[model samples]
Target: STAIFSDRYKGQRVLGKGSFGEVILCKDKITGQECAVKVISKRQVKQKTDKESLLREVQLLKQLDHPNIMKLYEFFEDKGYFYLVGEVYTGGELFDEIISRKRFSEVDAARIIRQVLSGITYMHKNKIVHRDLKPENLLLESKSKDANIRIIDFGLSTHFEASKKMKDKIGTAYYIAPEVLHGTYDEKCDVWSTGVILYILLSGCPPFNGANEYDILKKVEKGKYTFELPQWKKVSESAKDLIRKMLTYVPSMRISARDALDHEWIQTYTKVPSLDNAILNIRQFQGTQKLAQAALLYMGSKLTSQDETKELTAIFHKMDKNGDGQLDRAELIEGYKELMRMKGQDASMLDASAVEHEVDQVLDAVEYSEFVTVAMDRKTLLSRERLERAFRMFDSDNSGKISSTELATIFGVSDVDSETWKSVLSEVDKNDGEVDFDEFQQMLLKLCGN
Candidate 1:
C-alpha cells in the first residue's frame, strides 16, 4: 500500500458496491493474496469535492492498520478506472449479526463496542474522523462467533480539529451527529455515531426512530433517547454511562477518545493505565515510527512494492549529518543514536553506549548507494527471494561479509541459536567472524527449511 501501485491482480466477481466504486474480488498474480479491488471510474468523478475526497480516503486509509479497521493493501490508476486493493472480509455486516440474534448479551455488546472504540480511537489519535460510522459500515473478518470487527468505507474521514472546522454533512441519517448537520464538528461526530451503534447493538434498534430520515434527524438534533429497552434490562450502567458521554449534545462537552478509553467500564475490559511519561512517550514514538516507516517506503524495496531504483541521492543529504554527501561509520552511528533516542531511554543521558555499541557491531555504512537499500519489515514470508532481499539491506559496506554489529540488526530480531550461525560461517565465511552473501543465504534457507 505504501509503494508503487501494481496491476498484477486479476479482477474476479463483484463482491459488493460502494458510494464511489464497485468492489470486486481479486487474486494477486504475484503475492497470491485474495483481496478486494475498489474499482472507481475516473470519468464519473465530477464533483467539487470528489477528487480530494477519494484522495483523503486513500491517504487516511493507507496510514491506518488497526485490527478493527479495513486495510488498503495497494492501489492502481489507469486511463479509465482507479483500483484500490484491500482486504476482502467474508463475514457479513455486524448489524446483521446483532439483529439476527433473538437474545443478545451485554457481554457481546461490550466486546463489539470495545473493538469499535479501539478502531476509532486510533483514527482520532491519527487526527482522522470516520464521519459515516454505523453498524452497516462495520464488517466482520470471518463468519464465526468470535470473528473480529473492521470499520469500513472511510469516504468521509479526514484530518480532524476542533478549532477550524469544515462544512460537511457527511454520514448516515440515523448515525449522523447533531453538530454535523449544523455544519461544524470534529471527531466527536464519530463518537456520536458510535454511541448510536452501541445503543442499537444493546437494544436491537436505533436510539432515535421516526417515519423518515428527516424525522430521525429531528430526533437526533433534539438529542432524545432512552435505555428503557426490553433488552436493556440486562445491560450494565457503566456501559450505558459510556454511551451517554459519547452521545452528549455539545461537542466540547462530549468525552474525548483517551478519556473514554480510560473509563472504568472499558478499561476493565482490558488492562490498566500507563505512566504519564510513557503515555507521552508513546505519542512521540508513534510519530517516530510513522516517519521512519515512511522513509523506508519512499526507498522502494522487495520488502515493499515494486518501483525500485537507487533513489537516495537527495535523501542522502538528509542522512548526511556532516553535509559531505557520504554516510560513513561514525555518521551512521550518529543516525542510529537519533533513531534509538527515545524520551525515557536517554533521561540519564548515559544510555547511548548501547546505541553506539550496536552501531559498531554492524558494519559498512560508506556510500549512499548501499545506504539506499531499505528494510520494509520482519514479516515472516519464508521465501528465499525475500531472504536474499533482506541480505542486501545490510550488505552495507559491500564487504561481502557481515559483522556481529550487522548481525544484531539483520533479521531485525530473531532466535537462530549459535550453532546455526556457526554453520553459515563453516559453509561460507568460516567461524572466525562475518559471513558473506552465500553464507547468509544458506543460513536463512536452513532456518526457513527451504
Candidate 2:
C-alpha cells in the first residue's frame, strides 16, 4: 500500500515534474535523510504510456550499484500511484551546463566525460545498455565546486546478449549512433551518445546539427561530423581524435567505453589525485563475518563523509584502469608491481607469476563499494561518531544492543536458525545473545588487524 511509502518518507515540495509524474523532495521520517520520491500516477500508467518498462527500470536500478549512477533506495505502489524513492540530486542536469558554457574548459569537459564514460563502462560490463546518454541524462551531485557527475534516466536501458543487436531505433537524434539508425546496435550506441556530449562540451554545440529533427537524423545517420568549427580550432587534437574514434561510421570500429577512458585526451586532462593509505589498506583488508562485512559496507558507503572518501574515490578511479568501476586481478597485479618498483623493493624477487598468485589471494575482483569499504583508513572510518551511526542501522528499533533477530533481518536471511546466528555473533558477543556497541566496535577494529 502507499502507506508503506508515506510512513517512511514525508513528501515535501515538488522538485521536478514530467509527463508521467512529479519528483517530490521528501524526507525519511526515521533517518532524517532527504530523498527524491518519484510518484507516477497509476491512472496515467493505465493509459498505456509505459508499463513493463517502468518495472524493468526498477529492476535494472536495483541491480546497478555504482557511485556515478543514481541509487534507488525503495519502491512501493498504491491504487493511484507508484512511488520510487531514490537519491536526491541538488545540482541541475548537464544540459544546463552545456547550454550555459560558462567558464568551462577542456579539463572541465574531460572530467565530466570521464565520469559519464566510467558509469557506462560499469553499465556495459553488467550487460545493460543505456540507450539514452545525452547531457540531459547526466546530472551533478550539487552546484558546488566539488560536485560529482551522476548518470540518470535508465528508462530506455535494456540487458542484451553479447552477440545480439538491439533493434530499437530509439534515442535522441543528435546523440544516436549510425548503427542505431540502421536498426541494429549494441551498448556502443551509448558510447556514441557520450561522444556527442563530449563534442558539445568542448564546442558550445552538438556535433550533429540541423534546422530540424529530421535534418539532424539525416546527418547523424551519415556519421560525418567534423571539427571545422571555430571551437575546434582551439581544442586539443588528441580530444578531436577521441571524438572521431567514438563517432566512427561503423559501430564495430567505434572506440569502446574502456578505451575512451584510457584515451590520451582523458588521461592528460583529468586529474588522478592520490591517497597515502588506500593501496596499503586495500592490501591489508581482512575478511570478516557477514554481519561485520555488511556493517563495513554501510559505514563505507553511507556513513563515511564525502570529505573522508574524496581521496579514496580519486584513487579508486585511477586504479580502475579498465574504467569498469571495479579492480580485477590484472589491475591489482599491475598496482602492486608499480608500488613495489616505486618503493625500491628488491626487483629481483618480484616475479610476475608469483605476484599474480599473491594478488589472487587478496581478491578475485573488488567492487566499488567493497573497495571503498576495504581501502578506507581504519581509524578514520571507524571513529566513534561513524561507528555509532553505523551501529544504529544494525541495532534497528534504536535498541542499545543488536539481537539475533535484528541481525537475521538486516542480513535478509530468515531461513538461518537462531543457534547459527548466535555462533556467528560469538566472534564478538560475550554469549549474551546480543551484540553491544563496545563489542561491535572491537570486532571491526580487530578486522583491521588491531
Candidate 3:
C-alpha cells in the first residue's frame, strides 16, 4: 500500500555516505525536483522482508509532512536496496556550517536547538521516536544564509505505545544516552542527545570526553559533565542550567523537550521571527509553490492569544481590500486552486473555475473561528490556540471529555488496538480510560509541538 510511482525519479551524484548506505542526489523526472535519496541494501540488512508489516509505518511517514522534519515523498524496493527519497540540503551538515561561519553565539545556538526541538517534539507527540539526533543529522535547506533546519536520517526511529518497552540498545556513541546502553529507554533519550547537542553547540566540544566509546558511556552513566570552563564562561547561566537538567543521570528526571523550550534562554528571541512558522521547510516542486503559499496563508491566521489574533489580523488586512472587514472569495482565488490540487481533485472531477463560482454563490465572509478550522486542515506545527481548537473538534457533545471512539476515528480505518491511536490516547489519558480538557492541554504542550 506504500508503493509509489518509483520510476518518476532518476539518481545523480552522492551527497554523502553513512554506515547504512550512501545518500544520492536525485532529481524527480516528471516534476524536475531535486531530492536526497538514501539507498539501503536489503542484503546488508540481512533480514526477512516484511512487505505488509511496514505498510502502515510507511503510510504514516508519507503523511508525516512538516517544515522541520524531512518529508519522505517515496520509497521503493528493487532486487538489492531499499530507497528512501527525502529532502536534499546544499549547506552541508550543522557542524560544517558552524565551522564555516567561524563564530557562534548563545542566541544562535538556541535558535538552531529550538528548530531541532520543534521537529523532534512533533515526532515524539505523534508516537514516533528518532533514535539518532546528532549534529551530523541536522542539515540546512540551501547554501543561502540563515536557512531553516532539515532533520534527516531516521534509521532507528519507531512508533511507540504505552504497552511497548523499547529495550533495544541503539543510538550513536558520543551522543547516545546512558539508558540506551542498558537496552531500556523511551523518547526522553532524545532529550539527552539534544542536551549533548546543546552542550556542544554552546561550547566548542562535547560534554563527555573519552579516549574511546567505553569511557564516554561510563562518563554518561556517571553523569560527570561540568559547565565550568573558558568557553562556557561566556555562556549564560540559563543555558548551562538546562544542560545540567537535560544531562541528568536519571532518564525520568531529565528535562523534557518542553522544559528546554520553556527556559528563558530558549524562550527569548533576539528578533521576533516571522509569521511563516517554518513554512519554507516545505519543498516547492512543480506546482507545490502554491501549496507553500497556501500553508503560509493558513499559518498567518493561527494565534495563542486575543492580542496575537489582532496582530495576525493586521497582516491579513491587505486581502480585506474592500474594507468590508472580511475576506471573501475574490480575496482567496489564488489559494483555492492550490488547495484543490493538494486535495488531489483533478480538473474533470473538480474544476478550479467551478469551485470559485460555487464559493461566490454562497457569498461567505470569513470569520476568525472559520479560519481556525482552515488553519489545521494540514498537520503543521501546533500553537496553543490551534491545539485548543483541535481538541474541541474531538471533544464532541460539548462534554470536554474524549472517548476511544472519537479519538480512534480521526486516524481513519484501523483496529481499536492500532499502535498509533493507542499511543495517542495513552498520551492524553495519563493511564485513565477518558481524557479531559486539562489532560488534553498537557498532551498539547508536553506531547505536541515544543
Query: Could you say which candidate leads in lDDT?
Result: 2
Alpha-carbon error at 140 in model 2, in Å? 1.1
For model 3, what is the C-alpha lDDT against the true structure?
Answer: 0.58
Which residue runs of candidate 2 sit more than 4 Å off their true CA positions?
1-3, 18-20, 42-60, 95-102, 159-171, 271-450
lDDT of 2 at 281: 21
Show pairs that collide, candidate 3: none
Against the reference, the lDDT scores of all candidates come to 0.59, 0.61, 0.58
Candidate 1 residue-wise lDDT, 1-450, digit = tens: 333334376554557545455567777868788987766555444333555565766676686788988988776655455667789998887755543344455566667878888888887878777777866579999997789998886543342222110011212566888998898988888888888877765554568765334666789999988887555665677878998998899999998866777787777654422113322322332222222222222222233222122222443457766665567767665654553242122111123554465445345332544443421121122233444444554343456676765553332223234455556546555555676666665555444333
Question: Each candidate: RMSD to true structure?
Answer: 22.3, 25.7, 23.6
**Arranged by lDDT, best first:** 2, 1, 3
Q: Which model, 1 or 3, shows the larger TM-score?
A: 3
Across 223-286, the per-residue lDDT of candidate 2 in tens digits comes to 7767776546667789889988988877788899999999999999996222223222211211
Q: Which candidate is the best by TM-score?
A: 3
Model 3: what TM-score? 0.55
Model 3 Cα lDDT, one tens digit per residue, 1-450 = 245434566655556544355577777878799988776655445433356645567677788866778888877766555677787778777665564453456767788988888888887777777776776688888885589888886533442211111111112456888887787988898899999888777665568755334556677787787776665665677877888888887878888876777777788743322212111111111012122222222223232333333433544465566676566556555444444444333211123545566345334433533553343322133334444555564343678776654434322111123464466556556454567766645443432232
